[PDB]
Design a binder for this molecule. Sequence first.
Ligand SMILES: O=c1ccn([C@@H]2O[C@H](CO)[C@@H](OP(=O)(O)O)[C@H]2O)c(=O)[nH]1
Ligand SMILES: [Ca+2]
Length: 358
Amino acid sequence: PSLRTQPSLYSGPFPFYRRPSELGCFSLDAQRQYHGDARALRYYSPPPINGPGPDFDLRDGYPDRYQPRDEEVQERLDHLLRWVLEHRNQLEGGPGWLAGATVTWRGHLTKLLTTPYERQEGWQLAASRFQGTLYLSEVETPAARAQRLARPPLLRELMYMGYKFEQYMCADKPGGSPDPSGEVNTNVAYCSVLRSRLGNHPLLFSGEVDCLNPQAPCTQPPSCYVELKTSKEMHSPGQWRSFYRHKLLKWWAQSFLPGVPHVVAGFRNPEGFVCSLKTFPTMEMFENVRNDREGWNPSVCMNFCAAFLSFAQSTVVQDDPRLVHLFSWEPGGPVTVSVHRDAPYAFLPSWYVETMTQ
RNA sequence: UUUU
Ligand SMILES: O=c1ccn([C@@H]2O[C@H](CO)[C@@H](OP(=O)(O)O)[C@H]2O)c(=O)[nH]1
Ligand SMILES: [Ca+2]
């Protein structure tokens, strides 16, 4: 039993997707410690209007002022589960809403959305049903682990530059000014917890958020949030076209799911400076490929993700937090399923299970 | 589950 991923099978009308609502938030601090508040949220602070153009040095501080998260620590859903536990009797939707929902990280859903168009990287998703609720947690594929261990030095510095860009664009207090002199600590994260629904599948998911724009006319989250991105500067119309067809699809998927309405991109030259900023409204991204024979279609993304959720819901019949259905996908094939019990795939921790039982 |  498998699930095909070809875009032609999902070419129908755009499916129902509920306007996402923010249910709460949590922060992870410099020590990767959880706090149920917004202490890690930063505030959009672009270059002053009368000053010179941006000239952000994205390599400044590498690697002396870089404190990277330890990628061997596999946190899975743990931080989101703690939020849920601390809010289980305050969830909107009425009684038993959680029992009919699917719970995951925003980034897991992003990978589903782009699957009909992805040709390089596959994925694996572990699924467990517990008290009706379906939990989806990404598993690092063996190939992606090897790629991570063999990360080239230049790719490591480019990873730093994406985080450094945010430091040039965000301040710790509204109206404040950025401080690039500090350290880039990728243990720090602000996460928004959202409710949505795709087709008939209710969703509870969390996603890291880069910053809140206090200058935005709308200030009810998530509409006051801004997503920050970098990309290489482009000259040729063929370069812009390739950007529209590949990078923009992943920017759209990531920001559409939580309802983040703007992506602000910093374009960097070969020497590692950002000398151009451009805002991309999420709801206009598809306009750049709407009439492109090699473009992407948001309806294909969303219809496939709805089909996968229905495929997952029907495949995971047993309610058991120790049982895992592992969904595996590689480009050129369908999504396949295998069944596993206990370690290493089981991911719901006993401190969650036992508290939810009682 | 952030980055490229
Ligand atoms: O991008 C692709 C390419 C192929 N397949 C699927 O891989 C199988 C053999 O080619 C087919 O699925 P079947 O066993 O149900 O017939 C094909 O649809 C996909 O799902 N996505
Ligand atoms: Ca970002």
